[PDB]
Design an enzyme around this catalytic site. Structure first.
Site, PDB file in Angstrom:
ATOM      1  N   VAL A   1       0.831  -1.233   0.000  1.00 47.01           N
ATOM      2  CA  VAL A   1       0.000   0.000   0.000  1.00 47.01           C
ATOM      3  C   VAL A   1       0.857   1.272   0.000  1.00 47.01           C
ATOM      4  O   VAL A   1       1.992   1.266   0.459  1.00 47.01           O
ATOM      5  CB  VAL A   1      -1.067   0.088   1.129  1.00 47.01           C
ATOM      6  CG1 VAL A   1      -1.879  -1.191   1.210  1.00 47.01           C
ATOM      7  CG2 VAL A   1      -0.451   0.395   2.440  1.00 47.01           C
ATOM      8  N   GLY A   2       0.288   2.346  -0.544  1.00 49.74           N
ATOM      9  CA  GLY A   2       1.030   3.548  -0.922  1.00 49.74           C
ATOM     10  C   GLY A   2       1.686   3.339  -2.282  1.00 49.74           C
ATOM     11  O   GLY A   2       1.896   2.205  -2.745  1.00 49.74           O
TER      12      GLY A   2
ATOM     13  N   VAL B   1       5.556  -0.910   2.986  1.00 51.04           N
ATOM     14  CA  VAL B   1       4.373  -1.206   3.791  1.00 51.04           C
ATOM     15  C   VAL B   1       3.368  -2.051   2.973  1.00 51.04           C
ATOM     16  O   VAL B   1       3.043  -1.713   1.821  1.00 51.04           O
ATOM     17  CB  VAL B   1       3.655   0.108   4.275  1.00 51.04           C
ATOM     18  CG1 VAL B   1       2.388  -0.194   5.111  1.00 51.04           C
ATOM     19  CG2 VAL B   1       4.560   0.917   5.088  1.00 51.04           C
TER      20      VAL B   1
ATOM     21  N   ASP C   1       4.526   8.880  11.970  1.00 49.08           N
ATOM     22  CA  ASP C   1       5.788   9.594  11.685  1.00 49.08           C
ATOM     23  C   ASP C   1       6.337  10.609  12.667  1.00 49.08           C
ATOM     24  O   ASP C   1       7.190  11.421  12.308  1.00 49.08           O
ATOM     25  CB  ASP C   1       5.698  10.260  10.306  1.00 49.08           C
ATOM     26  CG  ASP C   1       6.291   9.413   9.237  1.00 49.08           C
ATOM     27  OD1 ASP C   1       7.531   9.315   9.234  1.00 49.08           O
ATOM     28  OD2 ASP C   1       5.522   8.807   8.423  1.00 49.08           O
TER      29      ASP C   1
HETATM   30  C1  LIG Z   1       3.255   0.309   9.340  1.00 44.22           C
HETATM   31  C2  LIG Z   1       3.847   1.599   9.957  1.00 44.22           C
HETATM   32  C3  LIG Z   1       4.898   1.512  10.910  1.00 44.22           C
HETATM   33  C4  LIG Z   1       5.436   2.668  11.491  1.00 44.22           C
HETATM   34  C5  LIG Z   1       4.963   3.965  11.119  1.00 44.22           C
HETATM   35  C6  LIG Z   1       5.491   5.271  11.782  1.00 44.22           C
HETATM   36  O1  LIG Z   1       4.733   6.206  11.994  1.00 44.22           O
HETATM   37  N1  LIG Z   1       6.745   5.343  12.240  1.00 44.22           N
HETATM   38  C7  LIG Z   1       7.163   6.564  12.900  1.00 44.22           C
HETATM   39  C8  LIG Z   1       6.433   6.842  14.222  1.00 44.22           C
HETATM   40  C9  LIG Z   1       7.899   6.416  14.256  1.00 44.22           C
HETATM   41  C10 LIG Z   1       3.896   4.017  10.190  1.00 44.22           C
HETATM   42  C11 LIG Z   1       3.337   2.862   9.587  1.00 44.22           C
HETATM   43  C12 LIG Z   1       2.261   3.048   8.648  1.00 44.22           C
HETATM   44  C13 LIG Z   1       2.401   3.598   7.357  1.00 44.22           C
HETATM   45  C14 LIG Z   1       1.266   3.776   6.532  1.00 44.22           C
HETATM   46  C15 LIG Z   1      -0.028   3.412   7.018  1.00 44.22           C
HETATM   47  C16 LIG Z   1      -0.155   2.886   8.302  1.00 44.22           C
HETATM   48  C17 LIG Z   1       0.981   2.732   9.083  1.00 44.22           C
HETATM   49  N2  LIG Z   1      -1.429   2.608   8.619  1.00 44.22           N
HETATM   50  C18 LIG Z   1      -2.253   2.940   7.609  1.00 44.22           C
HETATM   51  O2  LIG Z   1      -3.474   2.855   7.633  1.00 44.22           O
HETATM   52  C19 LIG Z   1      -1.480   3.482   6.434  1.00 44.22           C
HETATM   53  C20 LIG Z   1      -1.736   2.702   5.122  1.00 44.22           C
HETATM   54  C21 LIG Z   1      -2.897   3.500   4.506  1.00 44.22           C
HETATM   55  C22 LIG Z   1      -2.456   4.934   4.713  1.00 44.22           C
HETATM   56  C23 LIG Z   1      -1.956   4.954   6.168  1.00 44.22           C
END
Ligand SMILES: Cc1ccc(C(=O)NC2CC2)cc1-c1ccc2c(c1)NC(=O)C21CCCC1
EC number: 2.7.11.24
Length: 349
Positions: free
Chosen positions: A27-28, A35, A165
């Site tokens: 995804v993305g 991811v 993030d």
């Molecule tokens: C799987 C994951 C692991 C870590 C981080 C993160 O924030 N790391 C920094 C805080 C230290 C974000 C995601 C992540 C990345 C993208 C997504 C999700 C989770 N959950 C979701 O639902 C989505 C996929 C659809 C868009 C957002």
């Protein structure tokens, strides 16, 4: 209790994950990293799994891996991304070379949902309520998101929001250059490196998100750092002598004083037709002097959130010990600290 893992090729890399995780798909556009969405058969949750690939190739990568896993394990709030699981296929430290991080899958980011769209007032109330309630928490742990924009707010079909993030942001010169969303949300003290910064930088960014959700337009869509700053000062006004003193970059302070003084604009003549409670809030979030911006906890109490605000349901965090940041360690040293944190990991209820 070491589970069985199976192999799959995705993203032109072999993923090796516990059997509980089914139906993995990228995804993305690649926007979020490596991811995949997946089904967790053990909890019945849809989850995002992020594989950190060869995450100890340098000192800087061994320390980011550690930093992301620390940040993630600390955060347990409804409106902040946190870890439902971390795992490795490794049987020992010797063999440790991949970390997979599992979190909730919300399904999309704010960006995709709202780009170019104007939201109704009650929709904006709820989405910003949740951003401030999430940030109340982040900030209480002594952490600074530093890169809060729409793409790293994760949102499900009920408009429930998790912040992504926090604390990781490290874009290069070139990612921040020109007409680019990766800078439109930044507090000016940070875009132009005016002072030693703190947490108030993230309330500036909420102010920008909030205006865009209310009008369907970027608040400060600068074509470069200076054009963006010119856009900023025209609305909020050029710095006073109070603020100019606090600007510790002499270099940046000297260029600022070059600019013809301008008054702060009338937010009601900018944000025409908007709830005056919205505008009052915009006014107190979008203040140039960082020391004087409203805080997340202060903003949650503001009347605009009269319909969501509950003072006993807006929790805080334990402190986050980031002593490691000021520590210069070998690759093996970060790796081992990162190992420690994986195997010591405990699932939520
Ligand atoms: C799987 C994951 C692991 C870590 C981080 C993160 O924030 N790391 C920094 C805080 C230290 C974000 C995601 C992540 C990345 C993208 C997504 C999700 C989770 N959950 C979701 O639902 C989505 C996929 C659809 C868009 C957002």
């Amino acid at each position: 209790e070491r589970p069985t893992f199976y192999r799959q090729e995705l993203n032109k890399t072999i993923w090796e994950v516990p059997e509980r995780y089914q139906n993995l798909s990228p995804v993305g556009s690649g926007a979020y990293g490596s991811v995949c969405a997946a089904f967790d058969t053990k909890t019945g949750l849809r989850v995002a799994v992020k594989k950190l690939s060869r995450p100890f190739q340098s000192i800087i990568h061994a320390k980011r891996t550690y930093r992301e896993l620390r940040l993630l394990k600390h955060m347990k709030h409804e409106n902040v991304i946190g870890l439902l699981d971390v795992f490795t296929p490794a049987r020992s430290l010797e063999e440790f070379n991949d970390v997979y991080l599992v979190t909730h899958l919300m399904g999309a980011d704010l960006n995709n949902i709202v780009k170019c769209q104007k939201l109704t007032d009650d929709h904006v109330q709820f989405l910003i309520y949740q951003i401030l309630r999430g940030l109340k928490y982040i900030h209480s742990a002594d952490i600074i998101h530093r890169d809060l924009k729409p793409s790293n707010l994760a949102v499900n079909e009920d408009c429930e929001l998790k912040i992504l993030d926090f604390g990781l942001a490290r874009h290069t010169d070139d990612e921040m250059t020109g007409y680019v969303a990766t800078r439109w949300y930044r507090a000016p003290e940070i875009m132009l490196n005016w002072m030693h910064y703190n947490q108030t930088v993230d309330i500036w960014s909420v102010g920008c998100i909030m205006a865009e959700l209310l009008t369907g337009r970027t608040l400060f869509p600068g074509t470069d750092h200076i054009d963006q700053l010119k856009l900023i000062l025209r609305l909020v006004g050029t710095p006073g002598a109070e603020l100019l003193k606090k600007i510790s970059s002499e270099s940046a302070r000297n260029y600022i004083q070059s600019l013809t003084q301008m008054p702060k604009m009338n937010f009601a003549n900018v944000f025409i037709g908007a709830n005056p409670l919205a505008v009052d809030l915009l006014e107190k979030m979008l203040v140039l002097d960082s020391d004087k911006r409203i805080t997340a906890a202060q903003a949650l109490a503001h009347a605009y959130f009269a319909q969501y605000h509950d003072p006993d349901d807006e929790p805080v965090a334990d402190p986050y010990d980031q002593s490691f940041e000021s520590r210069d360690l070998l690759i093996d040293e970060w790796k081992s600290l990162t190992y420690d944190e994986v195997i010591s990991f405990v699932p939520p209820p």
